[PDB]
């Protein structure tokens, strides 16, 4: 339910959005919004490099679903002619025809509205819009949205939720969205906030009247307390706070903004006015924006959610999101984001803040004049223009030389990739400019659209009666009001008779000169207007009249420049001009002013600025967001210069950065032309980020104009000429530096754009047709030199222009054997079928191809390494797009749908000859976009090429072995689907699944056409998917929908779309054939339905098919609409009972769940987060957790009932515990603690935290200055990003800080404690664990304290000392891993022990050499290709399209030059061969024993059928025997059903097993290989369906025999006290019954019992009477009760005879000592102390015998090298084993440095044991020592060497021989001294793996008789028969058969249900001493009983302490004998 | 079943000194 310590708070992870096509810079930030009932607003804080200013700052946005009028034209006419934009921003078209309605959602409206449906021309989400206009005037209009998922959105009905013109209330521009409702009944209501004059200064108020149109999102209501399908607020009433549960509030400075007080919902505060006040001015009226969002708060209705608490203040804040800004008068930018949560106690806890940084404008440290050596030959210094004519991207030199116009476009200068720009040779420009008249428009080279306007004295219509200088000049038309072509209103009177000259004063600013104005000859300095007249340009010669956008709106506003004031008349469209706007801040002397020295140019790139030219300098004036100018910025001219009217100064973007430069021209000085760049990087762009968790980003931008110069240059290296299609520069994102401040690794990504596009018809930006991403890795010093190659991703996108998209197929990677290239598909929609069409006219061509824009066309992945295949791509993918025409009702636009119908995938793996090709095709889709006929295609492998391109370091003929017949197959996975949809005028639900059906085609490789498969080939009549060609049935599925009232499935679902159940095919006729011989024909249908399967007709049936078997699953019962249709009951299948869900009052969460058997689960929640915090389980135990203010578990408690008592962790009322917040103090917390776990979070540790003492050393004003600049937060933290830019800028720091340089810093960590027992006094102590994280949320390491020991040490600076020294706190560090910026682990360190928990700096122990660390290498895909171990060996992997070579450490052991036989393990790597489906079909191995013999190929073949399940498998030896005989059954033949459940397992080793699976996945009927049938019986339909009994019956038996019986515990209180609820109290297995008497809180078995049967009775539990079963048992009752700690570890265990084992645990939870108390005896010590290693393996052990064992581990590999077992009483080494390994880990050496024992007469030396292996790693040779009197190895046990025999030992040597299938075939024993060399042979069968001893037979074809059907050996040896149980179990062994039918020497056993042997009885029929041993196996207890027929001879008890094989201690106890 | 190769009778992958089988699975 909740985290148990395995999770944490999600790392914010704000990765950059790919944004491939448009090339901008993006970002996403999630607002802290509670999902609540499941319906919440979808909002995100979105940064975009192209976004302007907003209520969140420059470049930021928080978009809300809006609908607005189109601003493409000048302004909307607000007539019918205008067009609307959708929420996506697409033009809309009329759907169907209008209608008249007056009732909506059962609410009387008030007028006869005319409803017009609207849909987008390019449809993505298929939503439907309606426009509701009132016919009769007096009421408002609004919109509706019918989403495809049944949602309804109400947009703009209330005046507060729409943007209108304050003058005319009828004019509406943007219909903001008001309310919404889901299909369930959830409601969301948004309340906006209009603009007021509050807070803003008077000059803002007086200048801007009617500033009330702007709307701001204020409060968002959702989580309605009452269900209703009606849009809330449909009447126009205010939202009632009582009606909602959750509130999303956007604050603007009204509430408090401190870390001490929490804001309240109901605020009376004051609005805050921003400095950067601006207006939109695009809809024909001022839209004044003056506010900024300072906080985002989520408030919860606690009083309505939980009735137990009352809200006094009101709705309680749950999550606070602080937003601090960098406020300046020029522009505001968001540079601080922080999540905040206030606790209930008043204290607050905080998450690390997010810092952003943008580029600044410093024109005094970055600008100095430089001469342009390029223009030395340029002799024209007076008249020329620096303007971009053609639209290439950069302004060219426009001049006329010798009376002829010339133009020199821009050109790259020098090395490609350098921002240096120069100009080319002059070009004619044949279009004579003097042709046209004055103030006329001329085109360029005869281009389509008229671009520029010309004004020349020699032209016609020119009358300048008072000019100083004049010449023919050009100007950009876009720099003027669009209505210039035909002026209206003020523009018609201002221009008047005509315009004489148009002169630029900037990039888009134009100076105006009015012609001699006829009709009014006086020509005064003013012309009348509605609002205090307008001036006339040129008339008043001391004032400047120009068209300049000084307001930053997007329109050429009118500007009048005077000596003391600026006056701006804003543009409102259609030649209208608003009232004057006095712009203060600028003022110059009235005598010295000259307008020729005034220039207007945007220099900051934010409103145009003002520059005034003087003789020796110039002064600049930054525009403060259209609200004035700041103080002048004086920039000195070049030294020794006097600027006059003869010189020139032009403002142009020579850099292409979007900001103007200073182009100087002087006649007399040399060089004549100068240049000064005020900035080399575009400002006000986000380029730096840091989350203060260790991650720091860095963005870098490059202009698109400079990319065009590079693409032109590279295309100039070839004999061709490229064309540019991007007129205006776009500042595309270029590089993204990701730096980890913890690991030092950098990730510099590089992006490259080309083939830019722009649409001249729709004035939109389509995007680039090629994007080149390149990601490099640069690691820190000390790392491995194996640099991972930087990948390369070449992506081609369709720009929508046929000129580019056609020619983009050249830059591709060519391939002679490639398939047919993709061309777009243009179809129309006629009669519910796509009819293809060739484009009709050039207008139709334009619309179709435009729909293709933004679509990826081709993707190639390259690896950039030094390898020979570097020019070859890894994967290649390309998509085919389709544009479906939908309607032709409108003459302007048609409606289309853009989709990807065909995708293709290539897996070359840098091997061009042999690729892996795959392709998915959509044959048809419905009218709404849902697919109807999909098809997956796996292509066959190509013919083996004549030229092998694979590397030549591969083994012999491995490439020839990589070819299988399964690879050469064409596989067509054809699936059909049907969909439901509700098409109605007020209901719209789309994409509802109805039914599916999958088939698969199987054709040979010759059926593939030359060009490949396409949609046209498959639409034919003879195509490979025609309805007459055969196919294979894969399955079918159908979804059943209920209305919520009755379970009967209906024909068409409802708007709520409730799903009744899911039907899935499982069987057909062909799959059922696997039951022949195991199930009859009559009882098959009866038993199949008995399991729950049902029959129904085929979905999409064909001729001759009927009645597949299906299974219904997923049953759910839903409530009424008044409960939001929340599910009440759910069920899996028809065989198990339902579970009942009890929801809360508000129907938000589930509080109680009554299970099928009546057991309940109660949950108590916390309503700040709606997550469970206190759960009551089935046994009525209380589990409790407490949370922090952010939802992070801090404590864990539990208590309950054990044995009836009430024990547990002390409740918060029994004992209260204050959760600590400091990490160092929580370590120093001692026993006791009443919590199970105590979590301490410290995520802000990476930020320096100064002490309060040095805080006093720093005065208040000194802190006031730092706290003002946001470099230090209100708490004791220092901002990392703000510090770095504060040491760079204002370099002298006015305060010294001793914490930045090194000091105590740590990565984000968190502490975790864990108690082991309860309050009543235990050993206890605290289990402490410290986990470290990084900026990406990856575990750096984990530290665990131990009790005591010796260990290395850590220095206080973060470095590691290799010397080991004793310390109090062991603090073992495990899982030490170094990650790059992509998540792949590049270094892994072995565990170790060091004092303290603080992190060790990475660069310290990077190349420490003593710290052992592995090195990993990865490919661009993410797969591991090279792993270097600590010793130096490296296992490697080679990826190919059709196989994968895996070389172990011995395989690469030869290539280590930089064990015993490095050449032996050469070229023996495991090779797994894949098919086209990606399934392993071959596993290739290489056998080799000598360094010269070439290897044997061990081929194992697995065959997959067309369905895809493992069909057959054959080992190498049967493959070889099959190549001579194809009638040999393979090792395994499996049959499955359609889902994949194995029905039949036909194995030649273990017979044939048939099993019938249930619908829930339960074993119903199992037929074994011998013929025995096993039937299992479960509970009724109204129960969880647990097992009740298991019945078995052999072919010889006639009636079944119940061998297992299950009895489950009831719900009674007496069983909850022992925690028995839901458990099986009594289990009647075959041996005896195991009874569960008690359980613990942690679920561990407190007390249980076992009772065995009588030997003369079989386990057969007939009837339903439980008493007759207890009559077959024995009087002996073996009860084992035990006690446990809180961590589920065994403390004490009591055997059946009364002995107790005590187990104490250490602080680390590892056993540190054992005790044993015999009954009636004292507690003697078994294990004294126990110390462990770093990796948790046992290190040193001392037993109760006072003998100490020492273990030694290889520190490089953590492998056990030595075992020393000495006894310190006499200082004698009893055993000193020392192992040695090979690089894989095979044991090759076992030496003994211990002197031999006294048993061996005259023996002091122990010879070495050595071993050799083959490549398959089978044991070949072994040299051990055997005692002399062993003789030949047999089943007979040898005789011990007594100390009086003076026995000796001699060396032997064995050599083993192995079958090619793995069977051992011979053991060559040889001892040279004892001269007893023998040979043991094993005859292996010819058709199986059954092999017996040679003495049984030497015939291969006779061994299968010596085995039963099931694979069990029926004869152990000659004269010893083995009988077997019905469960494949060894029932009885006959040792010595005796004749005359007598009873013989025999042994027999009895096992439990899980197979554990509980009984063993051996019998001897000797005449002298007829003894019968009886051993009873119990938990840690053996009961050995020997009995004569006369009396009882011996009673022995064996007591075991510990697990077997791990230093177990045995205690024999004798009662008698 | 086929959890330890295809030899249903092979012992610890024929590497008895290095490996071991705890429960016989």
Residue numbers in the entry:
A (entry chain A): 13 to 618, 620 to 1471, 1482 to 2040
B (entry chain A): 2133 to 2157
Q: What sentences appear in the manuscript?
A:
Tc toxins consist of three components: TcA, TcB, and TcC.
However, it contains two small β-barrels, which are known to be a notoriously stable fold. Therefore, we believe that these domains are more rigid than the native Tcc3HVR or other translocated cargos such as HVR128-iLOV, which might prevent the protein from being translocated. This is the likely cause for TEV not being translocated.
